[PDB]
């Protein structure tokens, strides 16, 4: 809510991805904190298992509700940190409601 | 430019991809957002930081705001706590 | 300090080009036998695999930690 991105680059979302989709490289941000310089989910590689949703300790990477993201070009499907963070900002209100409804179950 | 600063120079090829297109960059750059966060004053020597909301936060850690010299910063939220 | 990964012999093919990819910056490799590391229980069996498959081999002898004598009483010796 403050505005600091949740991911702290533990990189086990990369470890458990079955398809090798997520690529993460990180370095200490000047703040001294730990953040990901590059976070790239290759959606064409991703098979939408939802384990990344499962694995994240801070729950920074989530399976968002939108299913309509069909794209004219293959490159658009590859997603870097800025698209995903932008995707996160757009759907945060519903993502928060969805996680709110299902967290007791998990 | 972006959070990290990824940028393409004039001589830099690999910048054509944006020609007649747009790049994905972020307003609300996080680097400055927690810096914009007030320092959570506390009474106790040590304090917790669920991240806010328990299960919907970060693995709870206890920060030692023991020296006013330094406001403890939970390695997960980047929230500074003022003893 | 665990030694369970220093037990079985492994033979690993020589490392090859890993150029950066222009579109996403991901590492890219043109060598198929790169990620392949076969595990063999004994030095003799691994050498055999190289000979029949025709790959060149350069075996490195196992080096195991030498026995080291330790005793809690010994360091309490003011003398030394």
């Amino acid at each position: 809510p403050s505005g600091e991105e949740r991911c702290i680059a533990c990189k086990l979302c990369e470890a458990i991805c079955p398809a090798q989709a997520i690529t993460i490289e990180a370095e200490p941000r000047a703040d001294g904190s730990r953040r990901t310089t590059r976070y790239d989910i290759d959606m064409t590689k991703c098979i939408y298992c939802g384990f990344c949703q499962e694995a994240c300790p801070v729950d920074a990477i989530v399976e968002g509700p939108n299913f309509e993201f069909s794209t004219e070009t293959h490159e658009e499907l590859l997603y870097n940190k800025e698209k995903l963070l932008n995707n996160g900002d757009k759907w945060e209100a519903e993502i928060a409601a969805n996680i709110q409804a299902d967290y007791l179950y998990r | 430019i972006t959070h990290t600063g990824q940028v393409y120079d004039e001589k830099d090829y690999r910048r054509v991809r944006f020609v007649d297109r747009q790049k994905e960059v972020n307003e609300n750059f996080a680097i400055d957002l927690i810096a914009q966060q007030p320092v959570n004053e506390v009474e106790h020597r040590i304090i917790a930081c669920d991240g806010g909301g328990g299960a919907l936060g970060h693995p709870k850690v206890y920060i030692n705001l023991d020296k006013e010299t330094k406001t403890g910063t939970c390695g997960y939220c980047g929230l500074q706590f003022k003893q | 300090s665990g030694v369970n990964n220093t037990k079985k012999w492994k033979m690993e093919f020589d490392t090859r080009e890993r150029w950066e990819n222009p579109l996403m910056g991901w590492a890219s490799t043109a060598d198929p036998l790169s990620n392949m590391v076969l595990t063999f229980s004994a030095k003799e069996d691994a050498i055999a695999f190289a000979e029949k498959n025709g790959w060149s081999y350069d075996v490195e002898e196992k080096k195991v930690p030498k026995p080291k004598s330790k005793s809690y009483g010994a360091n309490f010796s003011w003398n030394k």
């Binding site: 490289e25 310089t37 590059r38 790239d40 004219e72 070009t73 490159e75 658009e76 590859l78 997603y79 870097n80 940190k81 800025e82 698209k83 | 972006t2 959070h3 990290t4 600063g5 990824q6 690999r14 991809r17 944006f18 297109r21 747009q22 790049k23 994905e24 | 950066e20 579109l23 996403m24 910056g25």
Partner: peptide
């Protein structure tokens, strides 16, 4: 309730020694 372009965000990794612009 009531076109993106993908790119590497990480910077260069090996810096080239730049030649001295002073002629010798």
């Amino acid at each position: 309730p009531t076109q993106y372009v993908p790119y590497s965000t990480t910077r260069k990794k090996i810096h080239e020694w730049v030649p001295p612009s002073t002629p010798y």
